[PDB]
Design a protein around this ligand. Structure first.
Ligand SMILES: *[C@@H]1O[C@H](CO[C@@H]2O[C@@H](C)[C@@H](O)[C@@H](O)[C@@H]2O)[C@@H](O[C@@H]2O[C@H](CO)[C@@H](O[C@H]3O[C@H](CO)[C@@H](O)[C@H](O)[C@@H]3O)[C@H](O)[C@H]2NC(C)=O)[C@H](O[C@@H]2O[C@@H](C)[C@@H](O)[C@@H](O)[C@@H]2O)[C@H]1NC(C)=O
Ligand SMILES: *[C@@H]1O[C@H](CO[C@@H]2O[C@@H](C)[C@@H](O)[C@@H](O)[C@@H]2O)[C@@H](O[C@@H]2O[C@H](CO)[C@@H](O[C@H]3O[C@H](CO)[C@@H](O)[C@H](O)[C@@H]3O)[C@H](O)[C@H]2NC(C)=O)[C@H](O[C@@H]2O[C@@H](C)[C@@H](O)[C@@H](O)[C@@H]2O)[C@H]1NC(C)=O
Ligand code: NA
Ligand code: NA
Lengths: 32, 307
């Protein structure tokens, strides 16, 4: 899923690009 | 008789009453960035935490009025897990970027790297100080649960099948059992402390557990996708329920109680075991082992380091 198991990498985010491919940076600042 | 639950929440640490879980959690310390790991030394009135963005482990004195945050250990690239040895008075942690397990005194002094090989994504770490064993997980390319002496001895893999994202890990000190949560296979299992007699507790449908703790007959865990704290019976996996919800970003968790850090004799006695530097718990008689900071030689007498 878009839920990373890393504490920061692909978890915290600023833009959709910080997330795994096809995942989005949500309004709370986390990928989802 | 449910306990207070202490948990990290990235921006703060919180305490919630497991008997009044619907009510608001109280903030222990605030103004954090990515607080992840948390533990305590109840009899010293200390709470420890890691902040993976500030690359540090810090502590606070929770019986004092002033709510002060003191840096204990800095320069930690990804301190994903920590445990407090409430008996030998030591701090243990994992680092998933430098791929290490390390120990220090409670003030951060005399740091010693214990393991630095065959680690990839080390994460949870739990201690059995009166037995001198430490336990940890690694969710990397070879996922596993391991145990070793708290002195760095006798490292062994105890679980390496049916395992992928072992995030949570705790011990039942009354029943002498290990419990863990796997966030990819979506269950909670238990075993003996050597990994034998593995049994399922919660068989499935745990979407992303991160950390696990225990009190009396109840398991408690945080889940990253539900943003909540759940509980179930530690034998049957039944009575599954949601203790506390709408959590910003729940992380590590403990039952916050003196009863979870049972009093025992420190085998180091009153003279630090005659050790010049570190006196670490050990699983073989006399149940302590002297040690030195990283790179520093222990003389043949087994007590004194080369200053
Ligand atoms: C060190 O802190 C202990 C934990 O306190 C909790 O956590 C901190 C962070 C803060 O949020 C506190 O507000 C919070 O309580 C503390 O133990 C806690 O003490 C309270 C009493 O102050 C206990 O509550 C009682 O509630 C009613 C009162 O009538 C009784 O019916 C209950 O049976 C119970 O006595 C909590 O149970 C206790 N929590 C835990 C986890 O033990 C501790 O206080 C000392 O221990 C308790 C058992 C009593 O002996 C108190 O008189 C002591 O002060 C505190 N220690 C010191 C030295 O300040
Ligand atoms: C678990 O309890 C042990 C027994 O002590 C009881 O529990 C507490 C309340 C303690 O304060 C005692 O009053 C009580 O009887 C405890 O071991 C005891 O620790 C104290 C220090 O905290 C030692 O202290 C006197 O001993 C020297 C002797 O020269 C004096 O010079 C000192 O001034 C000090 O006042 C006791 O000797 C010790 N008792 C025994 C039987 O060993 C224990 O503490 C842990 O283990 C001991 C051996 C030391 O290594 C401590 O530093 C450890 O904390 C306690 N465990 C924990 C985890 O707190
Ligand atoms: Na790594
Ligand atoms: Na732990």
């Amino acid at each position: 899923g878009c839920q990373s198991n890393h504490i920061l990498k692909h978890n915290r985010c600023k833009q959709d690009s910080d997330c795994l491919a096809g995942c989005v940076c949500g309004p709370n600042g986390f990928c989802g | 008789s449910a306990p207070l639950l202490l948990y990290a929440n990235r921006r703060d640490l919180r305490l919630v009453d497991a008997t009044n879980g619907k009510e608001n959690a109280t903030i222990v310390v605030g103004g954090l960035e990515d607080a992840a790991a948390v533990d305590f030394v109840f009899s010293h009135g200390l709470i420890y935490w890691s902040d993976v963005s500030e690359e540090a482990i810090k502590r606070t004195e929770f019986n004092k009025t002033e709510s002060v945050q003191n840096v204990v250990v800095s320069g930690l690239l990804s301190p994903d897990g920590l445990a407090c040895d409430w008996l030998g008075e030591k701090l243990y942690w994992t680092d998933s970027e430098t791929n290490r397990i390390e120990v220090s005194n409670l003030d951060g002094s005399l740091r010693k790297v214990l393991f630095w090989q065959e680690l990839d994504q080390p994460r949870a770490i739990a201690l059995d100080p009166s037995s001198g064993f430490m336990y940890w997980t690694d969710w990397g390319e070879v996922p596993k649960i391991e145990r070793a002496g708290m002195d760095g001895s006798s490292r062994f893999i105890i679980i390496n099948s049916e395992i992928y994202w072992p995030n949570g890990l705790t011990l039942d000190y009354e029943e002498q059992k290990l419990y863990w949560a796997d966030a990819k296979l979506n269950f909670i299992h238990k075993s003996n402390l050597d990994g034998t007699n593995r049994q399922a507790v919660v068989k499935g449908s745990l979407p992303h557990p991160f950390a696990l703790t225990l009190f009396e007959d109840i398991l408690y865990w945080t889940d990253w996708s539900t943003h909540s704290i759940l509980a179930c019976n530690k034998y049957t996996g039944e009575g599954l329920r949601e203790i506390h919800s709408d959590i910003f970003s729940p992380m590590d968790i403990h039952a916050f109680s003196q009863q979870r850090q049972p009093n025992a004799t420190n085998p180091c006695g009153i003279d630090n075991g005659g050790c010049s530097h570190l006196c670490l718990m050990s699983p073989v008689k006399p149940f302590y082992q002297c040690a030195c900071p990283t790179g520093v030689k222990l003389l043949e007498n087994g007590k004194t380091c080369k200053d």
